[PDB]
Structures are given as structure tokens and as C-alpha cells.
Amino acid sequence: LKIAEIQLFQHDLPVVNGPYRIASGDVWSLTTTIVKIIAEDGTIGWGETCPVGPTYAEAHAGGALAALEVLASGLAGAEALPLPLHTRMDSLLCGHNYAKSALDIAVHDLWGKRLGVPVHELLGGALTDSVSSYYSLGVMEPDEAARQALEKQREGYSRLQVKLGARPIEIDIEAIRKVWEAVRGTGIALAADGNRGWTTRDALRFSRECPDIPFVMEQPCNSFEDLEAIRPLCHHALYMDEDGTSLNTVITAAATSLVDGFGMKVSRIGGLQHMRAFRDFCAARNLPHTCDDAWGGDIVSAACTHIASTVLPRLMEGAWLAQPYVAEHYDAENGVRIEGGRIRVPQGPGLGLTIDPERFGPPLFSA
Amino acid sequence: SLKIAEIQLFQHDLPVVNGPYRIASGDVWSLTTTIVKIIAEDGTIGWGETCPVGPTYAEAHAGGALAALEVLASGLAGAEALPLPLHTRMDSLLCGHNYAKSALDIAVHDLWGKRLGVPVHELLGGALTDSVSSYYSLGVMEPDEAARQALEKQREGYSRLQVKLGARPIEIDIEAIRKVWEAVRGTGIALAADGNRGWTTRDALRFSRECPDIPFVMEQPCNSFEDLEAIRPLCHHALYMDEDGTSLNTVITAAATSLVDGFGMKVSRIGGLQHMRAFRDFCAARNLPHTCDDAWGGDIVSAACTHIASTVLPRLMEGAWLAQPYVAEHYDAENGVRIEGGRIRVPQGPGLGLTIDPERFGPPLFSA
Amino acid sequence: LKIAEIQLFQHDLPVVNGPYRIASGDVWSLTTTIVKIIAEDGTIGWGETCPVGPTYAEAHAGGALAALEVLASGLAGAEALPLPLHTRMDSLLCGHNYAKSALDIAVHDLWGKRLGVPVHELLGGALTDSVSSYYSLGVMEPDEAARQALEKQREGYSRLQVKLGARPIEIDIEAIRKVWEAVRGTGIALAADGNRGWTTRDALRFSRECPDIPFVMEQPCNSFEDLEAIRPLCHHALYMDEDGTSLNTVITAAATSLVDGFGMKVSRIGGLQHMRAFRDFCAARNLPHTCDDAWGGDIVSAACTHIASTVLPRLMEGAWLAQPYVAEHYDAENGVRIEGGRIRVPQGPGLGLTIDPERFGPPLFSA
Amino acid sequence: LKIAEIQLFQHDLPVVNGPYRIASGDVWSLTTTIVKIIAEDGTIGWGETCPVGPTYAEAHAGGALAALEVLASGLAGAEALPLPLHTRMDSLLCGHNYAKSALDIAVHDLWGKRLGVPVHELLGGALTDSVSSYYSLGVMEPDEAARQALEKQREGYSRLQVKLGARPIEIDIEAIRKVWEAVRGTGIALAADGNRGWTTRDALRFSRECPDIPFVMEQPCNSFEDLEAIRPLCHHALYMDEDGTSLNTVITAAATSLVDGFGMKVSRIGGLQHMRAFRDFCAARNLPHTCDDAWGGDIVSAACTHIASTVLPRLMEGAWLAQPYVAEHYDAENGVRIEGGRIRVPQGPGLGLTIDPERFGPPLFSA
Amino acid sequence: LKIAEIQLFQHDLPVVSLTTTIVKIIAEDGTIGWGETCPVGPTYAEAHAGGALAALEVLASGLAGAEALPLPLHTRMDSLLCGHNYAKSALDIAVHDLWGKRLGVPVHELLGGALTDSVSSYYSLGVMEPDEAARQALEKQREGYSRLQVKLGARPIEIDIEAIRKVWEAVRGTGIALAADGNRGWTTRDALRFSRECPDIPFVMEQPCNSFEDLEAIRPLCHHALYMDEDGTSLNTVITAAATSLVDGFGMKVSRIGGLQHMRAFRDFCAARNLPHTCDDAWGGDIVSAACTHIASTVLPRLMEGAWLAQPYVAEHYDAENGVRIEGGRIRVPQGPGLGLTIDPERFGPPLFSA
Numbered sequence A, C, D: 001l002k003i004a005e006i007q008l009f010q011h012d013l014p015v016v017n018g019p020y021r022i023a024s025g026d027v028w029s030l031t032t033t034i035v036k037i038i039a040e041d042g043t044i045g046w047g048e049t050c051p052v053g054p055t056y057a058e059a060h061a062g063g064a065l066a067a068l069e070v071l072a073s074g075l076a077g078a079e080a081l082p083l084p085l086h087t088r089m090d091s092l093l094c095g096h097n098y099a100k101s102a103l104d105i106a107v108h109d110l111w112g113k114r115l116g117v118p119v120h121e122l123l124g125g126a127l128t129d130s131v132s133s134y135y136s137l138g139v140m141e142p143d144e145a146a147r148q149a150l151e152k153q154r155e156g157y158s159r160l161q162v163k164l165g166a167r168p169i170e171i172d173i174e175a176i177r178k179v180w181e182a183v184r185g186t187g188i189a190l191a192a193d194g195n196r197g198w199t200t201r202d203a204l205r206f207s208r209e210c211p212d213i214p215f216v217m218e219q220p221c222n223s224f225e226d227l228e229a230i231r232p233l234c235h236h237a238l239y240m241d242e243d244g245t246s247l248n249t250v251i252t253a254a255a256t257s258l259v260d261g262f263g264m265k266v267s268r269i270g271g272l273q274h275m276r277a278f279r280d281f282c283a284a285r286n287l288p289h290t291c292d293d294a295w296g297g298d299i300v301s302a303a304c305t306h307i308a309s310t311v312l313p314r315l316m317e318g319a320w321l322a323q324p325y326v327a328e329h330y331d332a333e334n335g336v337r338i339e340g341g342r343i344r345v346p347q348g349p350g351l352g353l354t355i356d357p358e359r360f361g362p363p364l365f366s367a
Numbered sequence B: 001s002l003k004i005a006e007i008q009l010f011q012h013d014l015p016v017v018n019g020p021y022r023i024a025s026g027d028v029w030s031l032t033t034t035i036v037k038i039i040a041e042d043g044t045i046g047w048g049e050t051c052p053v054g055p056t057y058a059e060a061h062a063g064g065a066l067a068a069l070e071v072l073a074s075g076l077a078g079a080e081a082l083p084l085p086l087h088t089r090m091d092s093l094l095c096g097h098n099y100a101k102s103a104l105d106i107a108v109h110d111l112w113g114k115r116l117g118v119p120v121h122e123l124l125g126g127a128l129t130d131s132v133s134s135y136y137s138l139g140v141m142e143p144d145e146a147a148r149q150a151l152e153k154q155r156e157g158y159s160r161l162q163v164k165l166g167a168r169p170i171e172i173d174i175e176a177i178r179k180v181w182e183a184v185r186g187t188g189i190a191l192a193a194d195g196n197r198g199w200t201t202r203d204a205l206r207f208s209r210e211c212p213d214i215p216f217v218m219e220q221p222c223n224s225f226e227d228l229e230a231i232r233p234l235c236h237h238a239l240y241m242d243e244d245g246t247s248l249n250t251v252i253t254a255a256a257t258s259l260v261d262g263f264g265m266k267v268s269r270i271g272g273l274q275h276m277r278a279f280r281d282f283c284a285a286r287n288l289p290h291t292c293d294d295a296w297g298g299d300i301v302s303a304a305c306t307h308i309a310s311t312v313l314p315r316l317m318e319g320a321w322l323a324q325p326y327v328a329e330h331y332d333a334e335n336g337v338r339i340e341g342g343r344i345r346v347p348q349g350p351g352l353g354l355t356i357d358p359e360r361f362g363p364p365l366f367s368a
Numbered sequence E: 001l002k003i004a005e006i007q008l009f010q011h012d013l014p015v016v017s018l019t020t021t022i023v024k025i026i027a028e029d030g031t032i033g034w035g036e037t038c039p040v041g042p043t044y045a046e047a048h049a050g051g052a053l054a055a056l057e058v059l060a061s062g063l064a065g066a067e068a069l070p071l072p073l074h075t076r077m078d079s080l081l082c083g084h085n086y087a088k089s090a091l092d093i094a095v096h097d098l099w100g101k102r103l104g105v106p107v108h109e110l111l112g113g114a115l116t117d118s119v120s121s122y123y124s125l126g127v128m129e130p131d132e133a134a135r136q137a138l139e140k141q142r143e144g145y146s147r148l149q150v151k152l153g154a155r156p157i158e159i160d161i162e163a164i165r166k167v168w169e170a171v172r173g174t175g176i177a178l179a180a181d182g183n184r185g186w187t188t189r190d191a192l193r194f195s196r197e198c199p200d201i202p203f204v205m206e207q208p209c210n211s212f213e214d215l216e217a218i219r220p221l222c223h224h225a226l227y228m229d230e231d232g233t234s235l236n237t238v239i240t241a242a243a244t245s246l247v248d249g250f251g252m253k254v255s256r257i258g259g260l261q262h263m264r265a266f267r268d269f270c271a272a273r274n275l276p277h278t279c280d281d282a283w284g285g286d287i288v289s290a291a292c293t294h295i296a297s298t299v300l301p302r303l304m305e306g307a308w309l310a311q312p313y314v315a316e317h318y319d320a321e322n323g324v325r326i327e328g329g330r331i332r333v334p335q336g337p338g339l340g341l342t343i344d345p346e347r348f349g350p351p352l353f354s355a
């Protein structure tokens, strides 16, 4: 089955209860980029990519659109299968995983609709009908973080990510301690996310002062080299997030045993094809990981949920979704949502979405 | 959610045409293959196969295949016929025994493709090519004769030659590789020197040191992972792992430490197509060439290897070796894959692309 | 003296007060595989191998029988001595140490009977007339683990292994702490056996939270690579168990100083010939080790007791026997047993057992 | 002096007598992206960035424009100095060095015009009035490469880069051998550029077969990890080019002594501010390097020539310019050009260019 | 069976003399076992005849009542004296002799079972003029030796290189294995040169330099195999060397490693790691040579680089009938009980020392 046409759209998503505060930069609203692939038989597949602001990673909305124009321009006539798609995409544009991801998601949607099976089947088969999620607390005053921590634990979340940084480390330590005192005993898993915001000096301190607090340190420092620096000097587990920019890079990290796990985003790694290989890699190495993306609506969230359902539950640290912060569903009936801290896995063909072909207005670009 | 309703096991002898096939770790005259038939609840069937290359090549043998498949089969009825649910269930029934698990994995991919009406290569992500390269394996033999066969095989169209060495003085192995190279230099054919675990580090160092002018890769020259690590910083020839690549975990250790420049990879050793496709993706990310082989087998094994090989970037695919030229019979005489002009046409039918008579292998040895 | 005939049998050993709980898979009852070697003069030697279920290690009862069939089929005519035996066995079948072990044990039994000396003499000579043992606590409720631990210390065991895993690490930590509370001050040695069940994340936490508890961490993680990962980050001693699958691998581990000691099983290493080499390696390196096997009756237990008797007591962490969990003795008079937490070493020829040749019924296979 | 306005333009540059063949992908024509910064007093500075096709690196013309739109939109009121500029740019957009480079170049042009001094003075002071260059031979038949090598050597180039790859390694070896047979005896420097195109297998072979040929191996393989893999196994010097994506990564490479030198592009490292730091790092480490960019007209070429003039000549491997492949000059009088294999350094204020404010037509974007 | 008495003797072994030290262990039933240790003079290793005797007096004085088995023996010996492996080796050999005699089986059976009835040997060429070495090399190849060790050093590296090239030219085509033994005599500077100039000559470099550290220095810079000899002073050190893959093989001496009990462990270690090794000792008569031959017979022949014996340089036998000897470059393995020797209890005269 061949790609006949590709259409590109953008749409705004304002942060409900915003802003969402991250040490690398806060977000109040997001411009998502939507891909529709149309097959020669008229069937469609949807894809999406939505950077969380322009400073979180090497990605932005205008960049997604520009890269997708290049990719779309060379894709008519290509087979709508993941390996042929990626081979063609790599021949048109180097890098830009986050743009490539949107086309990859759309191909998986189209493929599943063609064969009449859910994307999770195409990814090897779901191991579960519902997946755990985790809640991310933005950088905030310690007492409020403690208050929300308990609130989200009572709502059913199995894991809590505490965002830190962009302020003195004293306050970050105060925050993690207060959150811990609020939720200790509940068995909820704890991640301290520095979002590249800490010098090695302060990362060493954070771990050294808190041996009694069972957080994992998620991307505390700004580079792969700084993770290597602190690894032999921190007795807490270390997780890579922002630095995991390719399958190659994660292979370097986990075979050198630099980290004990990953925050992983579908768009950063280049789509479900590479996310599936990443999952298989982590399973082989017994390394827990999340199944996230940067931001987005129903399309992104469906993609993450489908991949998350194929991960051994003990290794799946949770699928984080932007859903609670997004005031819209592209598909009000079937769009995934967090319920009791968990997410029900879609069972329809493809991503499990029915979205009107003209939902996102006239195309910004067609090829 | 199509479930497995019944599993049947069989064994069948495959005598080596023009045998024996000579390896440093153990010669082979005839091989016992183990066949799995998975019957789904709608009566659709999937075939799988595993056939160790004698009992001394690797930690695997025909009797062991059957015994492990009995344990796996006994706990598999009612399982979903999808790769991840299958492997999760299999791992809950029996630790290790990748070569046995591989047969069930292949059968599940066959059944899955038939249910969906698509070839196994589609299920593995999509073929990049309609035909794949192969390589010829010259057994350990007299040097001038190795050279004569090497040229014959090059002229048949093989893109790559594997020269089997070992179980004799290193002097002779060096003589062989030089005679072979003299015969084919200038044809551009790729060259692998396979020590088949047979060299001490002493002799491996010598083999590389004496032949900088011969562009072989050294395939599994020594007996262990540690010995590969020993010679790696002291050999200026590329090094490939084969026998030591016993799990996804192990190959990840090897390639991210850059111990090797490539792999001979066998579907059964890695535990089936599910793991082989992850391995493929790992090699693609690392730009590491690899083969797509298995130990031995008939049409079922050979189809499995051809399907995965079709999904590899041709510049990284060192060839799919098949036992086909050494196997007198085809299970499916019409659709069974075969080597023609040193290459292999990729099957396009649903599943593995085979139709095998349900009673081809006689009554089941075991059913569960 | 040459081997004239080999006979194979299987026998079921139901777990007394079962099941025995392991993170890698629990056990309710076990099929043991018995080897009888008949020499050309009619003298017999017995051997045995019994995996602890099919998921603990790469070994199962059906695999033992299948491998022993191949080995037995090429063994008539071989000298009944350890090196000629292993040389012939390696020419017939690659690997399968647990099967090869049964034939090795039988050869040592036969050899000792021919020469009129105990197996411990053939292994270099016993250093003691009784050996220490250790008790293995299955995964259980922390308070009950603590109660059983004190009870076993009071029986006279010099060491306790606490099995952990297949549940949240919080509970494993609660268990080790409560066990320690119960037995501290008695000087009983403590092992915390993760049985390959912990991610590196959780292994780091287990050590980090408990510097005050003198456990060794026995095989906390699933691979050699994960042991390498946590080694520079845990201040507790690390022991290898399941990963010690050959003399080659042990040499890698202990000369890189990856571990401070070993759980070692006779079947995993391939028999008494390799176990005595292993013992000599540990003595040269001052590394303590156990002298165990997976499971089995009188034959396995005799083998473990004989090798254990030749180890310097300060390095011998104990010989664990399945005996207390096995209802029946093959030789009720001479079969070894744990008394006051210790085991009296047999002094008769060979393994020190006399088993009726028809004890296990007719042979399943003869060659 | 503050920035009052930023204008963005694009312009076509067809490869004179192309294509220019690279393993990572050939080029027939390039779209350049031009920046004009206007200060509050009306003085202007010009900048430029022109990726060499979309597959050479993680950069493309559409991406340059999209990123520059984001950057320009937040730069009004910023001080026209390198550190204030980069600090502001980094607060607006993560990464995208190739886009940031264009604004950096425009800032240096403006700054030099305000102070009445050449950019090379602002960079610390030129050490020479003319700089060496090197000629890059595209991938071509070995016989043709050898003849072109001979012609360029006789023309006066001090160094030749031979582009290789995207074909059997046998042909690359034939090519470097013939080039060597042509230029041995002339003293010209030789670089063999694999352009990320070789597996480690083939890179090992290329070096092993040619110890008598004094090439440096420039970026033979596809990743930093692959350079690390071959480094202890190749007796030829190794240079990094494509992998040198930030000052951070260069520091990792040269302090671990992974490489003996660099091909460095101004746009990849993020502009003249970072190129100057890179220059100082190479001087401290005694590591030779080029002063190139990916492609471009007079603006890019001026920037490269200015930085190149400040490098110790013995460490300056040459400033490669796209000029011979570019039909037009933005400033026909003052635009730099290669003559006798060398480049005369401009001496006017700023970059030393006068370009009509309307040369590129109406702005595509203004902020 | 307990040790009742231990007697020590010294004897001047005439050459074709060196002071050998003989141990007789007498069991309580009157059964005797013979052991021996004989350093090659005082400068080759940290060992000498006077030291052997002094250490053996200490060991003998605390051994009455000990069990005549290898592990009880070594446990008691280590409790009486630290190190002195070469002295301990003599008692270890005597214990194995006595044990085999008691059970009526050869030492090779007690060591796990012989894999062959005859073992390969190798010839050691002393440091000599290059043309002479080449002439003798061919001579010894034609006698049937499967391996040739060329001793080098104590002179300019230029001449060592000339010597190895001339030897190789003389014997290439015969398949004889070649070892270049630097005898700790080369600086790393010269060891690097020796390998670098000779990639075409298939020697292994046996102990080229003076320390373990120097072997570590040259290992990543030499494309020739490296063997350890003199530095292999304990099982512990061997484990360090071979698991770090510092070397590709060993020259190993029974006395240096502390006797047959430790040599057997070393053999098993090399078999696990696929590392070839010799089975030698420093010097000695029939007792030392029997011990080496028994352990050598239990090694996989492909891994056994040869048992070197002092026998052709020793002008007498303790047991002329059963003493091992090299014939056609190989050694027939003894088959009688113990070491396979019958030596008169009064052969060496009255004890120098008894305990």
C-alpha cells in the first residue's frame, strides 16, 4: 500500500492550569504539528509532534513544520510500512527525529487500519489492557509540591516525578524532603528531575545529603559527560532523559551501564519504530523506562499508550501524557485519558482514533 | 485475539548432500531437525523449525530441542499467537534454551502473517529488497582446493565467501587464506576467515599479523568473549562475533564496547525472529554489518532467515547463509527458498510463504 | 578400569512443607535424574542432577535426561577417571554442565570404590570431619522471616541466606532489617539473595539504605554486566551465584575483583572435577564460597559434602543441602543429613553410599 | 549599541560545474539564508548560513529560516555584542547552532563597523595577511581524482582533501593510492574524508593497507563511538569533522586525545564566538584544524577567512571556501576568493563587505 | 596414613655439578615417598640450594603426624613457613609419590588421569653465536623436538634479532614451534624493537622483560604472543595475568608454583582459558623429572607446549631402569605406582637432617 498524498497542519494547545514549569524553560501554550498521510486507496493515518516549547530540546514547532515539508516532498509513492518509510526519510533529511516521529506514527496508524488491528499488535502485542502513568510536578514552592504529591498519590498515580532546578539547590533539597515526608509509606515511586539544570557540584550534593530518600536522579546535569562524571560518585540511581537523543546514544549509555533507566520520548527517538527497538533493548538489559512524549493531543497520547502496553509492567515506569493539561480531544469518544492514575489501552484498528479529515482546517502544505 | 489451540512436535533427518560439512568445533554428516506445528483455534497452522549443527558446535542438540519444546508446548495452549505474549509465556515456562524457543517464535510469525494476509517480512517492519545476498561457506579443506572452490563460487555470483579454518596447525590456515585470496583478489568478493572458536589467542594474533594485505574479517577466531577482548586491541583486521553472541544482552555488551565490527548471527541462537529483529535494529543504529543465518535446517528455517534478511539495509547485510544447497529435499518444493546466482528471491505470500502438508513429517512425537 | 555400561533413571522428589519460594520461579516438587555407571568388573558408581524447576537456570529435568542420553551413548569404553571422562564428554556434547556433572559424580564414586577411599581423599584430602551449612529462607513476610531466622540460628546454623525479590524492594528491605534485628549479636553470617530479581536501581537502594547491616549481596541482579554496574557503587560485598556458569566465567569475575565470593553449585560448574579447580582458585584468591547444588537426594548431597570437607573452613560459607526438604533417603543408613546446622563427612569408600541397583526401577535408557 | 530590526532572506546558489559529490549525499544547488541586523543608528551587519544539502548534517535551509524566525522575534533591544547575543539566543531556542551562527556573524560585522576595525581584530588580531586553503575533491573515479589532485597541487594548494565513500571500500583505496602516486614528492598535505561513510570494518582496512600513505583519516565513520572504536587500531592520524557538533563535544574529543585534529565549520559550532574559543582550545592542545563552513557566498566566506587569519599557520590546515563553486559575488570588489591556493585577508571594517540592502529582495521576515 | 619421619639429603648432580635437595617422607607403615628440588644456581630465581635446605628443615620440623595427602600437607606447610614454594614443592612431590604407592596407582591417576602415554618436549638453546644457534636448531628439529626455545639476552638486542632470524631461516617449513626467551633480560625499549622488526617470524616472546609491569607495558604494543615464565610465582599471580589476558601462555615450573597440587590447579585454569603452557622445572634428577612428566601427561596435548627435563644434562639416574628420559624429542609416561621409581632408602646416605 502506497502513500498517495501527505498533508500538514498546525494547531494551538494552551496549558490548562498553566504554566507548566521546567528548569529548561516554562510552557504556557503549545503549537502542535499534525500529519495526515493518505494512502492510494483513500485510507488515512494521523501523526503528531509537539515540542514542549523551543528551549526544552533541540526542537520547535516551526522546525517541525519545516522538516516535515522536506520529508513530505519526497514521500509520495513510498510504501506505508515503517522500515521503507524510515529508509526513505533518512535519504531526504538527516536527523530531525521529532519531525520524523510524526510520519512514523501516521504510518503505524494507516498500517493498523489496513490490516484491521491495533498499533499495539503491530508493535508485537500488548501485554496489558491498561498501563500505569506518572504525574509530573512542575517546579514550585516545597510545601505546595508536598501538598500536590499527596493529592496525586491519593488519585492513584504509581509514580511521581518532582521537577527541580532553576533555583538554589538548597530549595530543591528542601522540596524533595518535604515531598518524601508527605508520601513515604505509600510505596509510590519517586523521580527527582533536574532537567539538565544542575552542575555536577550540586548533583553530588543532592545525592550525598539524601541517602534516605529513594528517588532516582533523572537527567540531573546538562550533558552525557556530566552524567559520566557523577555516576561513580552518586549512590542513587541515575536515569537519562534529554540526552537520549538516538538509539545509538542509548546503546552507548546502557551497555556502559551509565544509567539505571530512562525517561524516553517517542519524538526524540524518532518514532514508534525506534521506540520499539528501544523497548527491546531495555528488556534485554533489565532497565526500566517511561513511555512519554514531549507534549501533544490524542494522536501523540495514543502512540505512547500503544507502545507502553507492550512493555513488561515491572519495567514500565509509566506513560506520561499531556492530556490533563490539554483542553481538547481530537476524538472526544476514543481519545485516551488518565483515569485513577492509569490509562486504558485502545483496542480499535490503528491508533484507535476517528478524526474528521478536515478537523485541523485547510492544510499548511501538501505533497 | 487468535489463540494457540494445539502444538505438535516432530523430528526428521536431513542428510548432508556431498558431506560431511567440516567445522573446527565438530564435523557433520547428517542432521536431525525438530519441527513445530502450531494450530490456532480456527485451524490455521504455523510452522517452525530448529536444527542444531551437531551436538558440539554450540550448547544445543536435537534431543535438547525436543525436550525443551515439550516443556514449552505443555504450557502454551491458550496463549495469544503474537510475539511478545508468546515470549513472555515461554520465558515463564523455561529459562534460556533460545534455540528451542526460536522454533515456536518462527511458527507464531508464520501463523500471524497468514491470519493478517501479509508476509513475515511485513510483520518485521517491511522488506527493503525483493532479493537478498548470500555467502558461501567453504568447509575446512586443502588450500589449493579451497582456492579453486572459492573462484567457482565467486563465478556463481556469491557476494561473499566464508573460509572455515582450524583444528589443524595455524600454518595451514594461513596458507589457505592466502591461496583463496590469490584466487579471488580483484573480483571484489567479501572475505571472512572463520576460526570457529578454534584458535588460541597466540595463533589468532599470528593470523592477523602475517596477513595485513588480505582483507578478511576474523570471524569468531577464539573460544570465548574474553579471548576476543584479548586480541581486539592487537589485531588490525576487523573482528566479528558469531558463537559468543548468545543473547541480545551479550551482543549489546559487545557492540557498545566496540569489541567487534560485525556479527554472524543465527536466528535460533538469539531466540527467534522477535529477538533477531531487535538485533537488526541495534546493528542499524550502530552501523554494524551482520549475516542473517541459522545453524542448519530445511525450508522453514530458510524462509525465516530470508524474511528477516530482506529487512536489512543491503550495505549492512553480509548475506543470508542457507543450508538449502546441502539439503536434498524441500518441504514445499514450489515455494521453498533456494540460492540462485548466489542470491535469494524473497517470498511474497502470507506468513513464511510456505504450504507444507500437515502430515509431511508423519504423526506427532508429542502434542499439547 | 573402563566404563562398561551406563543406565539412566528419573525419580520424583516432592518438596516437604513446600513450596520453596524463589524470585526466578517457585518449586513444589522435583524430578531428579540418576546415573548408574557400571565398570567392566561390575563395580558401580552413582551420580545425580536435579534442577530446581525449569526457570531457575538454563536447565531442566527433561534436558538432563536428553543430554545424558547423548553422553551415555558415546561413553562405554572410556576410563573411569575424571580427565578422560571430561575429555570424552566434551567430544560428545558442548556445554550442558548440569548433565555432565551427574556422570562426573558417578565416576568419582566408582573411582573411590575401586581404590577403597572416600571421594574427599580423591579431591585432595578433607581438612575437617564436619562441615558448616547455611539455611535458606524462602521469600516470605518480614516478621515471619525474622522468626524463622532466629529459630534457625538457635538450631546451630552458622549462616543464613535470606531470599528476596519478585515484590517491591521496600518489602525486601523491611525483611532484611527485621531478620537482622532478630539475629544481631549472635554472629550468624547473613546473605541477601536477590536471585537475579533486582534492577540495578533497586540493588543500589538496598545497599545504600543498609550500611549498618552486614549482609553480602548475593546475585542481586540479572546479569554479569549488572554486577559490573553496581560493583563500584555498593559498599556491601557482592557474591556471584547464577552467573557463575563456567570455570572460565569465574576466573573473569574473580581476577577482575568483581565479587567478594561465590555461591557455587556442583552441577552448574560441571561436576567435582571443575568444582575442585574452582575451590583451588578461590583459595589462591582468598574468596569465600558455598558448596551447593541446585537440589537432589543423597547422591548430590554426598558430592557436596565431600568437596566442602576439603575447603579451608574460614573460606567455606556452608554446604546447602536439599536433604531437609526431601522425604526419602536413597540410603537411609549412610545418607548425609544436617544435624545442629552442620554435616558429618562420610568416611567410607566413594561417596559413602550403598544404594540397591534396582532402587529406581528399570533403566529409562542404557548404553 | 542595540539591535533595532532583523531581516531574513533566502537566495539560490547553483553549484558551478557540479554536482559536488559527498558520501552523505551529493549537491547540485544550495539555498542560502541571509540575515541583516539593523542597529538603532541604522548601521547594518550581514550574516549567512547555508547547509550543504539536507542530508550532510542535522541542518537544512528551511530549518535555518524557521529557527532564525524564532531567534529574530526575541532579539530587538538586545545589545549587538557576541556574549549578550548568545545569552539571549540561548534563552529563545535550544541548539540550532547553524542558525545562531548567522546572527553571530552579523553581530561581528556590525560590531567591527561600529568600532572601525576588521572582524579579525575583534577576534584577537590577525597573525597573517593571507591564509592557506585546501581543495576538496568530490567522490569521483580514482583516475580522475588523481589527475585533479595533480592539477590542484600544481595550482598551489598546500593541502588536498579526497572525498570517499558510498561505494565499495576497494574503490576508495584505489582512489587514495592513485592520488598518492600523483602527489608523492610534492609535499602537499593529504586528508582522506570518509564523510561518515565507512563501517569500522572498512576504516580498519583503509588504514591497515596504506601505512605508506600519509593521509589523515577525516571522519571515517558515522559516530563518536565508532571513532573511539578504531582509534586504538589505526596507526594513521584521525580527524573529527561532522561529529564536532558543540564546544562541549570537541572538549570531550580532544582531551581524551580521540583525534589529532579537526575539520571545523563555523555554522556547526554556532558562530565566530564559539569558533574563536575552539581556535584557542586547539592552540592549547597543539591540534591542527581547518576553518571552514558547509557552504555559502561572500558573507560565510569572509567569516571563515577572518577567523583563519588569527590561527598559527602551522596549525591552520586551510580555510575551505565554497567560492569557486559559486557563480556570483554579493560584493564583487571585496568578496574573498582563492588565488594560487591561498586567500588574501580582508582589511576593511567588519567583514570587509559592502552589500546593497536590497540585494536579496524584500525580506521574508522582519522582527 | 600419617607421616612418621622426614629425612633431608643433598646430592651433587653431575652435569654432562648442581646441588639438589632430596626429601624422603616415611609413613607410619614404613612406606616411603621421594621428593626433590633443585634451583638452577642462585641468580635465575629467588631460590638456592642452601635456601631449599633451610626452608625444608623448618617444614620438616613441624610435619610429623600430618596426613600424607596434598591438602592437609599444604595446609600444615603454610602454617609453618610463609612462601618458599620451591621448598614446599619437594614435600608435595614426596607426598604424591607416597600416596600413589599406598593406593597402587601412578601419580598421573591421582592428578585426574593421564590423557596420553607419551608427552612432547622442547629443546632449550643456550645463548650463543647466531650461526651456531641456527645449526643446533636444525639439529634438534631433526632429533624430533616439536618446539625450540631460543634463549636470548645479556648482549645487544641486534645479536638477539640476528639469532632469531637465522634460527627461523634454518627451521622454517618444519612446523617446529618457536619461543624467543628473553629471560627477563630486555628493557621494554628492546622488547618493542624485537617484535616490531620481526612480524614475519612466528615466535612467542617468553618473559622478555624483568617484571609483570613491563609485560603490561609492552602487551598493547607487540603484535607477537607474550608468555609469562619467571613472573609466574604463585597461583594468585597467574590468575591475575591470564584473566586480564596479559599473556597468551606460560612457561611453568613445578617448584616455582609450589608443587603438583598447585600445578594441577594451574593446569585446570589454563584449560578453562585455552592457554598453552609448558610443564617444566628448574633442574633436577629422576624425581623432579618424573613429577613433571606425570603432570604433563594430564594436559590436553594441543595445550601442552612441552615438558622440559634436565635429564639429558644430568650424568646419572637415581633409578636407571625407570627414570624418565627424552627419546626422539618425546617422553614416555611412567606407569608404576607413585612416581614410578624405586630408589634405595640409603641411596643418598645418612640424613643431613631428620624430624
Ligand SMILES: C[N+]1(C)C[C@H](O)C[C@H]1C(=O)[O-]
Pocket: A022, A052, A136, A161, A193, A195, A241, A263, A292, A293, A294, A295, A320
Ligand atoms: C514530564 N515530561 C515527560 C513532560 C515534559 O515534556 C517534561 C518531561 C520530562 O520528563 O522531562
Ligand SMILES: C[N+]1(C)C[C@H](O)C[C@H]1C(=O)[O-]
Pocket: B053, B137, B162, B194, B196, B242, B264, B293, B294, B295, B296, B321
Ligand atoms: C556457516 N554457518 C552459518 C553454518 C553453520 O551453522 C556454521 C555457521 C557459521 O557461520 O559458522
Ligand SMILES: C[N+]1(C)C[C@H](O)C[C@H]1C(=O)[O-]
Pocket: C052, C136, C161, C193, C195, C241, C263, C292, C293, C294, C295, C320
Ligand atoms: C539456596 N540454594 C542453594 C538452593 C536453591 O537451589 C537456590 C540456591 C541459591 O543459593 O540460590
Ligand SMILES: C[N+]1(C)C[C@H](O)C[C@H]1C(=O)[O-]
Pocket: D022, D052, D136, D161, D193, D195, D241, D263, D292, D293, D294, D295, D320
Ligand atoms: C570540504 N567541506 C568543507 C565542504 C563540504 O561542506 C563538505 C566539507 C568537509 O570537509 O567534509
Ligand SMILES: C[N+]1(C)C[C@H](O)C[C@H]1C(=O)[O-]
Pocket: E040, E124, E149, E181, E229, E251, E280, E281, E282, E283, E308
Ligand atoms: C628451559 N628452562 C625450563 C630450563 C632452565 O632452567 C631455563 C628454563 C626457562 O624456560 O627459562
Ligand SMILES: [Mg+2]
Pocket: A193, A195, A218, A219, A241, A242, A263
Ligand atoms: Mg525528564
Ligand SMILES: [Mg+2]
Pocket: B194, B196, B219, B220, B242, B243, B264
Ligand atoms: Mg561462523
Ligand SMILES: [Mg+2]
Pocket: C193, C195, C218, C219, C241, C242, C263
Ligand atoms: Mg543464590
Ligand SMILES: [Mg+2]
Pocket: D193, D195, D218, D219, D241, D242, D263
Ligand atoms: Mg569533512
Ligand SMILES: [Mg+2]
Pocket: E181, E183, E206, E207, E229, E230, E251
Ligand atoms: Mg623461560
Ligand code: NI
Pocket: A235, C235
Ligand atoms: Ni561511597
Ligand code: NI
Pocket: B236, D235, E223
Ligand atoms: Ni599495530
